[PDB]
């Protein structure tokens, strides 16, 4: 807990990063963030300034848990394609081999 | 349970998104997709079409538990401001007011 003008910041709430990092001074924009561990029921979203405060609008709805897999993508069968295609992308568990339905991915020529 | 090809899929499993729906036939590209439950040790991610399959290279080390939070900016104090100006973004725990650091996120003009 370390003080930070009139509040206190932690360690324990984190922003990883806002998905646009600019918009119309308009507001009332969609965006969504990446953060570590918050609770839904116990969260907020605020922008300010030195003597301006403003709160993003969202419910406990709008915080979503999700999985994100970076990888490595496998090359294609066929390096020599001259046109696009498009292969199917899935997931599948390792102990009972059961899948996940398809996603469309197209490869691209060289 | 349900028989697709040669595997059997199941809705437990399931990819959300790709990041990018395209990319070089050469593979050794980096992406990450979003996917509900799945056990980091127990999984992997799979590309093909019926004759061909090719498998994504990643760790347990690569996938990745976050929170995405989607929701609406606040329109910034002054609407007539002529130049970008780049204000703080941060989280905010409602019970205690404890805060996180800062990213910034720039309001563009009218």
Not at 43 to 58: L, N, Q
Not at 84 to 100: A, E, H, I, K, Y
Request: hydrophobic share 35%.
């Amino acid at each position: 807990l370390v003080p930070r003008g009139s509040h206190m910041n932690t360690s324990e709430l984190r922003i990883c990063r806002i998905n646009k990092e600019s918009g119309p001074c308009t507001g009332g924009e969609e965006l969504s963030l990446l953060c570590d561990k918050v609770q839904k029921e116990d969260i907020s979203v605020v922008f300010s300034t030195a003597s301006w405060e403003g709160r993003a609008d969202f419910s406990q709805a709008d915080v979503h848990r999700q999985i994100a897999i970076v990888f490595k993508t496998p090359p294609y069968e066929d390096l020599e394609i001259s046109e696009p295609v498009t292969v199917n992308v899935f997931l599948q568990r390792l102990t009972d081999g059961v899948c996940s339905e398809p996603l469309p991915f197209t490869y691209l020529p060289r």
